[PDB]
Amino acid sequence: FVNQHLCGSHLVEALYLVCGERGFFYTPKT
Amino acid sequence: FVNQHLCGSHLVEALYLVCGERGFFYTPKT
Amino acid sequence: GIVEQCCTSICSLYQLENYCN
Amino acid sequence: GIVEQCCTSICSLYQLENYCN
Numbered sequence: 182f183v184n185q186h187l188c189g190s191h192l193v194e195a196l197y198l199v200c201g202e203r204g205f206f207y208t209p210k211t
Numbered sequence: 212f213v214n215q216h217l218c219g220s221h222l223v224e225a226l227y228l229v230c231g232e233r234g235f236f237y238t239p240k241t
Numbered sequence: 242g243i244v245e246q247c248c249t250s251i252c253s254l255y256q257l258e259n260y261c262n
Numbered sequence: 263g264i265v266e267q268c269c270t271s272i273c274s275l276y277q278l279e280n281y282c283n
């Protein structure tokens with residue numbers, strides 16, 4: 182699922198799945 | 212969509228929609 | 242944290258926005 | 263940032279994990 186273009190909710194979803202119990206930060210304007 | 216129990220991907224999705232271009236942080240172990 | 246406030250209990254806009262950057 | 267690396271270009275695990283806490 183990760184080696185593709187991932188935008189918007191799709192990217193958030195990938196972060197969620199990969200990062201698991203760590204959580205993550207989503208800072209699109211960087 | 213926000214005034215309910217929101218868990219896992221559902222919570223991430225709500226953050227994404229509410230926070231918009233700001234982005235967000237998801238730090239479940241807090 | 243957010244899970245306690247929004248998953249285990251009923252979320253709010255007020256709470257969600259605290260986690261926006 | 264992440265959008266440049268994963269949305270506008272092809273993402274990687276390596277890049278994604280940089281945004282985990």
Ligand code: NA
Pocket residue numbers: 205206235236
């Ligand atoms: Na953060």
